[PDB]
Symmetry: C3
Subunit: 322 residues, 3 copies
């Protein structure tokens, strides 16, 4: 149903045909920028980017995306008391929608996005809440298409290893449901998404040709991994054995498995904090991904990072333009 003036607050508010449409729009606009004949469809729009908590990355994707299409951005960073402290979400939203054509929100609970959406009558895009992270997985699913041209998501295996009882885990679940992905969350039990969402999402997943299989077992859960996905742990205790290293890549029995990570990643034995941990916890060569896999032929990590922009642009063009 028309993306026009819709919000983008979580993936499951969309059908798989809507998702597929966003993903194809993201791909036309990628090809168009790269080819030099991008049709700027937001040439008068003013977007507001509220970031209650930082993110170098989402800001940059939302600013470059907007700008390529002709829109101007007002970045509102973590500096004012945050929404709910001195002024009502209901009043912040209501004022903002009088001036801006669309609002990105990144912050705290999904309640804040859902209430900003309710009262600012402009589309509200969800840059990450504690509960969900939809724009990320748009970049991801698009990176997956590109590295398996023609295979449908229906016949792709995704392993997300590590802590999943969080908005990354929740988001993998909503992804599988709208996609039909053979999605394996490979994590200690304590690190697995909530019962209800997994119940809901499996049913949808299966119904679309995939299924959500929850394992602690590395080689088994990885068995025929197409992609292996992880993100930062901090924990190092239960999570240690889940490190994506070339052994894990080998245990797929797959000469063409690929690696993804929503960055930042701790793979060096260099960076201030990463190194601290390499020392303390013995994790040398890297923490959740080994540097030799991160800098492997197999990581498509920086195409994944580039795709963050092409999909946020798709969300904004889809909902503000016709």
């Amino acid at each position: 149903s028309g993306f026009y003036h819709k919000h983008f607050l979580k993936l499951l508010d969309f059908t798989p045909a809507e998702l597929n449409s966003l993903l194809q729009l993201a791909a036309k606009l990628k090809a168009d920028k790269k080819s030099g004949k991008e049709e700027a469809k937001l040439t008068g729009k003013n977007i507001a980017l509220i970031f209650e908590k930082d993110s170098t990355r989402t800001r940059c994707s939302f600013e470059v995306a907007a700008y390529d299409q002709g829109a101007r951005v007002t970045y509102l960073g973590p500096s004012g008391s945050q929404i709910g402290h001195k002024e009502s979400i209901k009043d912040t939203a209501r004022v903002l929608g009088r001036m801006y054509d669309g609002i990105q929100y990144r912050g705290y609970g999904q309640e804040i996005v859902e209430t900003l959406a309710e009262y600012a009558s402009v589309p509200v895009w969800n840059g990450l809440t504690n509960e969900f992270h939809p724009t990320q997985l748009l970049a991801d699913l698009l990176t997956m298409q590109e590295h398996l041209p023609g295979k449908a998501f229906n016949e792709m295996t995704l392993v997300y290893a590590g802590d999943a009882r969080n908005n990354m885990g929740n988001s993998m679940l909503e992804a599988a449901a709208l996609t039909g992905l053979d999605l394996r969350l490979v994590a200690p039990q304590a690190c697995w998404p909530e019962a209800a969402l997994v119940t809901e999402c499996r049913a949808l997943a299966q119904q679309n040709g995939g299924n959500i299989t929850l394992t602690e077992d590395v080689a088994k859960g990885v068995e025929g991994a197409d992609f292996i996905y992880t993100d930062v742990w901090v924990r190092i205790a239960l999570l240690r054995e889940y490190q994506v290293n070339s052994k894990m890549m080998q245990l797929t029995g797959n000469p063409e498995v690929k690696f993804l990570h929503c960055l930042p990643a701790f793979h060096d034995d260099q960076t201030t904090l990463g190194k601290k941990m390499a020392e303390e916890f013995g994790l040398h060569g890297g923490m959740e991904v080994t540097d030799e896999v991160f800098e492997s032929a197999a990581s498509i990590v920086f195409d994944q990072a580039e795709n963050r922009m092409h999909t946020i642009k798709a969300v904004m063009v889809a909902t503000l333009s016709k």
Copy 2:
């Protein structure tokens, strides 16, 4: 007189005919954006927005206004030592006028705006100083026109209730003087606007068909209000009895009284801070405005908020273009 390249530092530097002209320009441009045929008249201008002290709102009004007209904005937020600490106002201004086409300043005393104006060679707009707040009252007088179409400001009665020995009180006075409004500051005496300005402003007010009446009685001052206006108190002690609640609205004897507030406002028993005020000093239903009046069919608060943008745009178009 034509505003081209004039500074906008306080309302009394303008004649009522100049004020009326700003206000009409604000309303052409409002209608033009709403109708989709805004003529961007600032398409090469670079504006600098110095905010020595925050304001979510003024930044957004200045950014959306500038951008609609084609200008690019450089926001300079409270982060660098403020103007006067490590570098001369005389030097800050002189460098800035070499690069930018106009400077908005929001901060501390009127001395800083008046000095930036003196040395920057570009128009300097006053986003709020301790002494004055002119752009606000532009939004306000425009909101008043719209909600009493045809009635001239001479025949509208404005009540500004609450604390008034401040830039809001000073600004109401300058507004009455250039307008001819029957303006009633319904404030405790400890809170009245500095005597001479009232002496000056009332003689100009009268001269234009209104008169400024300073009182402490709610009933007396509210008598036949057209609009009732307030803003945040903190104090709760002398100000308590001045809360705009439906009894105040009723004491106008006027069923079409409409309410105004330069936001933010403490009307909830939600807003963390406000909630403490509700417990701590007992202002339940809100502090300076009751939530039932703030969310009344009588409040024009968010049109007032939207009008902040249409009038900042008028100031900028008037002074950077012909």
Copy 3:
């Protein structure tokens, strides 16, 4: 020879013929914007401005310069943990180059600029590191041409007085080397630039028609100066006797001597920090420059400040377009 897609990390990575070409491009673009027929050559570019440490001035020069040419800017200010703390320079750069067409970096060591340059596949401009400050001296050498039309830099005498064991001193050295300037660093011995760079850049300086002289003698260093240049001291102890005052200007025996200062400057007995210093340390009339020289007909300080913009624009046009 072409600057196209080249980085800009220090002056000595360029030949005197490349430098001369930047400086002439800077002057065409100055004249063009002043004569209203600037050809915006960056109309689709997205530039990222990383400022690990503040600067009111560099941000403004980079923002106005980029915007006049049609580019959109994403200012990344000191707010995220800085590059190296939670994420690899190698990863920050690699993600940024996927989105932005050029990166300005201002911060810490030259190692950070040189690594960002290495891994971001776009040009990286050096806004100031501890070791070098090239864009500044572009503005400076352009301000010098303009105030001695026709004299070649070979036939100019520059005095840089005060502390030089720093990126301003290092930068004067690289300037002399590529220019042939009779450059005199009139500094205490404690404050002389490091020896190896002086060995290198004197030899290049001479080879181009100038020579680098370092002295503690104000009178012998100043002797026939064309321009006298200084910057902030804090130190007040060894540096005191180096204050540029009208006696120094007189000791050039040169009536046409002109004064330069990369701002901010402590010349008032007004600004809070300058007043502490004025009373505590008895430097009335200013600290490193006297106010009577700063506000002299000899100070070309604000043309120098304006020129900051025309040269950053030259750097960006030179390296992003053809």
